[PDB]
Structure 1
Amino acid sequence: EAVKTFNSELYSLMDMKPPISKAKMTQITKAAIKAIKFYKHVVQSVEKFIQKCKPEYKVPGLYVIDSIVRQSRHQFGQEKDVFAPRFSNNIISTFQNLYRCPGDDKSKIVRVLNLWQKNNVFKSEIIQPLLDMAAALE
């Protein structure tokens, strides 16, 4: 039920016109966090969404990752957060999918990466190749 609830909330984005409502992003994040026991399933669902969705939903998909990781780090502690480490496994592939967004959305992705870097959400060994991937598209 926890994962089913999260999946329903996440996939409801495809019925919406971005930018996505703060309240909707909060509901998605809250569902993810309540389902922390099943964090692996939550990560897998978000990655699947990003792989399969229309280009208009790539930035929203990244905002889901960002919102989950930020809330988890706040709520459980940066060292105890299980979400950023799990997202890190497939992150290179995830961003390859994300960069299939419309051209003027690339900057929105880089902004998120810039903020992750400033706040040490991932180490440079993760952040730098993601940044390099943005630079290579141009």
Structure 2
Amino acid sequence: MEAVKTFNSELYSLNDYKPPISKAKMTQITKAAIKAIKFYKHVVQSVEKFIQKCKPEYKVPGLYVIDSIVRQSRHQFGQEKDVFAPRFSNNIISTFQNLYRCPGDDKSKIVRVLNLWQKNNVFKSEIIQPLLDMAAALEH
């Protein structure tokens, strides 16, 4: 799958940069995801695999990838037609378990994204609440 390989290249290329990741790079990754929309399941799988396996400093960049793809898809295809948020929702507990293996000072960045997803109805509130609870439990 050409489009999936192109996306994989953009995503893995995060490893060639020191975080914080630039807007330009995030845009590149996002554009590749959207071009690969026929294979959205493979795109989600690749992002989840990156988050599972990447160095701790890339956890938050990985989350930003999810954020950017989902928000761009909702914009470009419509909030109700977006295939990405529903697909990312499937393994989201797993994803966040992996995300919270970030450095201590990056935990607040994860919660910031969760709060924005809730405020902006990016994901269903039922999905988000356990992810926030996981953040808080880590502080106790």
Distance in 2 separating the partners of 1:68 and 1:83 = 7
Query: 1:76, CA displacement in angstroms?
Result: 0.4
TM-fit CA distance, 1:122: 1.1
CA–CA distance in structure 2, aligned partners of residues 42 and 124 of structure 1:
24
Instruction: Give 1:21 shift.
Output: 1.1
Q: Is the partner of 2:40 in helix, strand or coil?
A: helix
Local SS of the residue matching 1:113: helix
Q: Deviations over 1:59-94 (max 9, x none)?
A: 000000000000000000110000000000000000
Are 1:95 and 2:96 counterparts?
A: yes
Separation in 2, partners of 1:127, 1:121: 10
**Counterparts of 2:123 and 2:40, CA distance in 1:** 18
- Count residues with an aligned counterpart: 138
The separation in 2 between residues aligned to 1:123 and 1:70, in whole angstroms, is 14
* Deviation digits for residues 14-54 of structure 1 (CA, Å, limit 9, x no counterpart): 11100001111000000000110000000000000000000
Q: What is the aligned partner in structure 2 of residue 10 from structure 1?
A: 11
How far residue 124 of structure 1 moved from its aligned partner, in angstroms, is 1.4
Structure 2 Cα separation of the partners of residues 122 and 12 of structure 1: 27
Deviations 1:91-135 (A, max 9, x none): 000000000000010000000000000011111110000000000
Question: What TM-score results when the alignment is normalised by the length of structure 1?
Answer: 0.99
Structure 1 runs (4+) greater than 4 angstroms displaced: none
RMSD after superposition: 0.4
